[PDB]
Amino acid sequence: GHIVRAQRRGNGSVFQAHTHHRVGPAKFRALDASVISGMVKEIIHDPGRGAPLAKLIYKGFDSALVIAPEGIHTGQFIKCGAQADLHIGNILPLAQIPEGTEICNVEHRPGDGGRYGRCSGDSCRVIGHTENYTRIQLPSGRKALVSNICRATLGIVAGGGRPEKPLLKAGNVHYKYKAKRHTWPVVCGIKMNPVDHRHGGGSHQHMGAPGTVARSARPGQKLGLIASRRTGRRRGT
Amino acid sequence: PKQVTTPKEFLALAARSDAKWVKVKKASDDNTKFKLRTTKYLYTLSVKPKFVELVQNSIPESLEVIVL
Amino acid sequence: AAHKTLRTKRILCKAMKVNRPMPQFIRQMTGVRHIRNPLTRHWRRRKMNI
Amino acid sequence: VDNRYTLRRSLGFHTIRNRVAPVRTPGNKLVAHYIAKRQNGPHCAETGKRINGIKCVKTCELRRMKKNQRTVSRPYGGVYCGSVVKDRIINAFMEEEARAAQERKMANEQKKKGK
Amino acid sequence: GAGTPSFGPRHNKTHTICRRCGNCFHIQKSKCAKCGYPDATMRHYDWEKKAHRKRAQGSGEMRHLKVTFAKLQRAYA
RNA sequence: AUCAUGACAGGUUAAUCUUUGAAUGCAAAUUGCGCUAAACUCGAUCGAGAAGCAUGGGUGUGACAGUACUACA
RNA sequence: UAUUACAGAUCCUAAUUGAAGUAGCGAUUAUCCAGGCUUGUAUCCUGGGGGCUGAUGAGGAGUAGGGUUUCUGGACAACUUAAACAGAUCCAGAGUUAGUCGAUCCUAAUCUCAAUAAUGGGAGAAAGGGAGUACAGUUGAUAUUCUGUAACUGACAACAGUUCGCGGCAACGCAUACUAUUUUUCUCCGCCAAUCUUAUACCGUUGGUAGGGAUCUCUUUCCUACAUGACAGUACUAAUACCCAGGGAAACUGGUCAUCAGGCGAACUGCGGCGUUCUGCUGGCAAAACAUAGCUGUUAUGUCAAUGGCUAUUGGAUUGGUCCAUGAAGCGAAAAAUAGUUUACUGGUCACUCGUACCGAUAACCGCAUCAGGUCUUCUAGGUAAGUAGCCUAUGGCCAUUGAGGCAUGAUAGUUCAGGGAAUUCGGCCAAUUAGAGCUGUAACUUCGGGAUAAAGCUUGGCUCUGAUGAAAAUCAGAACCGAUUGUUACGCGGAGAGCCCAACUGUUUAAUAAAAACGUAGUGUCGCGCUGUGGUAGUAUAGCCAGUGAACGCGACAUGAAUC
RNA sequence: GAAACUCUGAUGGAGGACCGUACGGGUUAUUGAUGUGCAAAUCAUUUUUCUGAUGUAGGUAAAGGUGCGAAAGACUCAUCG
Known about the structure:
Oligomer: part of a larger assembly
Number of helices of chain D: 2
Number of strands of chain D: 2
Helix content of chain D: 25-40%
């Protein structure tokens, strides 16, 4: 057999991110001990990422490409800190914020940059305050103990509802993955011959083998549904 | 190559100790052009045949004068 | 060419001054006959590969 | 007649730097003359508008020109146009005047306790 | 398809003259295939023992080295 | 050039020793881009050429860094 | 004593037969006649016919590559499918001139060392960035490089004369330093579409003068020529963008080809401000260059006056639309602010290094070769026409191509064929018919967008006029009359309709027997994982690489393959 | 037209729309010519596409049980299960 397209993404020659026109890494300023006001100089769109970024100035002018909540405008004053009040814009630690509210770009570790809840039209919800660890629900469903000192932007991330509209033409998806990375178009494994992929070969196109494989299964062998505790139509539940 | 309107300003440019020659030259409409050479530029002076005779005399004696 | 480098130009010089007939007086001196200049060529037939 | 004309420079291709225009010589011969590049010249920060009172030439040949024609006379002469400078005066006055009146306020308010 | 027509656009040069070898210096990869420049050691293998002795000592002038052979004749004769 | 003030295709040793190469002032598909107390040599105090300047490690010499250890204030 | 005896091994190497004076001498417009030079020319040159190429040209020029093929002189043993005095062949000499064109300098994708007391250094583009040049002349070959003439840019020096901040309500104007820090701008950026306008080319209405061509007759005719560089200046005409002063808007007004603009201040008025374009007038500048006329190197006259483009290309201006697409960096330059130190501005010498000839496919490159193949780009005339089509022709370049004689048969590329009209054949394969434009007229079915140029009819020339719309020298409509009923005259231009199957669709694919129903796609669905993680890779250095400049509207793994049911 | 709005004409210039040029990109048919070729894949006529998932140049990245592959076991210097 040959090495399979799933294995070949590691070696990373043509399968690298197209990172040329990307404006910078989206994160907070570092922590550095109250309250600090910060004007939104402008809000710009970087390629690949569906969200906007908003370039702040903590005037020297110290810059920070923070990811943009919805309802931010140019020449708003954003207020990072503990004793900053509640507006959509402001960047509070999880000690201060009320529970049962939608927050954006929340950090895992303090002073980190921002980790959970970054893509367009997403938000971490806050469940409740234990003592040190403010428990929050992530967009998927999963729940996470996160320390109260670490920061999070208030409100929902901008650019919501982009997949509501379908892309009618193959050309629209060509321009989508030009900004991101080469991973498209996908040739299906059944169509390929036996050497190229596991599902390939045979007189008539069909999978033949069970098509559902363990965590223990090797490189080359992990193809199709990996460790699928259910399959088929998820009716109810 | 600049042109110079006033006959007085021409004679200031002539007596700089830059200028190597002046060239006299007949023109259309019975005019004539006094082309002062300088290291940088060539200063031309269009004149009518009323004040043609006086200007040549006005020019410094030392500077060489090539007639055409 | 044009836009040749200098050390490219050095090789093309040496390749054309070396291209000539063998002199007459070596055959008179040594008395050997049938020696050809090895670095003779024609531009159209054999390329240099330099 | 044949009015076709060669490129003079040894670059063949039709890039932005290698562009030509046909011109009649003194000798009745058409010939390539090469186009010098366009310049936008100084826009302003804030809004993004053209300031007046300066030519769009290259900034290198802006140096060769007189110091007069490089600038506009006011404070923030080149960078900011007129009405944006008016707004900076009004705000930077009344930000400082409110802060100065705050020092008058916290002087005046605390004196009520003594009397 | 793969023959005469596709020989047409063959104008770029893969290899260029090499400084140490002077012979096949790879422009993109920057290495002399024949001699291994710029590795400080000079390339030879025992599987090409034929091709090595074309390059190796004896082939050139030996300006310093021939006079040091000639001393050792005189001392032992 | 001949009984020598010694011919030259002789043989050594010593000079001179171009651009390179371990290649070594920094590079190189480029005759690209540097730096220097005196002395040297032309050039008429101040330019140029000539000749220097690599990395690694050894012994010596010097200088800097430290809320490392310690004494005397 | 042995590298010891050959007819064979599709044996090895070297030479040589028949076939055979046979197959064949292709492709590319077309050659003919008189002279010159010669032992000798259809071929090498001259002159004159007849032709071809027919602005994506065998025209004039360049990247990449070639490397002397360039140029002059002499030469024909060989080569250039015959011939040869010719040649990209042979031989002997000669030729490539730069501060302004390039390289050099900066970084991009990307590659490679070093430090971690570090926060980088270096490489990487002869199409990106990038200070600065033009004309005329000259050689057997070089020219934006040489000469003449006129500019311009940078760096390093002193030195002479001015000057120690003012105008406008405002937009802004006018003569002002340097170091540093920070901030901003220029450099500077996708694609598509529309309108307006310089320059160049071309066609035009009005004339004109210089020379040449044409002539039985006709033509106050036909052709050529009617031109001004970089650079520097300052008039008022007149534009659009934007801003300023007054002005203070519904009976809403102003404005575009189009969208539109306005109390966050419109119309409108200023001999406003300012940027970019424009017209005229100069300097450069007629001294040059070109065309006539005459004299033996140079003297004469002349290169003029008026004013349109519905035509094209280029530069620029004013805008719009489009994106789950938002379309380089760096060196460098100027400005501003805040400190501190202050006088400034205008007006001789020098400019290193390396490339520079010619070809650019048509014989100079890659295909073993002077190979009907292949290979990036530039300047782009007239007529016909919707035209960068096809067809014809000025400027420029050419006859690339063995000759002499025959003409039955056959091969191949072509026009045409009475009557029939697919009977031929596996099969309407092939060819024929259809065709451009204007005016009529258009069905079932449909995802309501399509189908649709559906189908099916008619008209089309020449000549003399008339009218409408524009500014307009253009284009459209209408009527007479004419003869072989014919007219998109050559050139170029769909045969059409009615069923059924497969894939929805634009797209991709076995370079060299398969272009499809195969692959792809949007759409639909399932599975894994919250970063100390997941899917990879990588290999001994406790190396760090890819998704990741990333975070579930995400990343990765599969399967189905638009919509409708 | 009581209204909600919808009839006629112009304006406008959207679309992985259509016809159609090339020394553009492909290569359907004649199973034509050639098959001692001009050519170790050509020529003629016909045909497909022609603002895009477009073509194309230079530099640059990926290397042999690997690479890359809108997948044909295709391609990786006339060489590839």
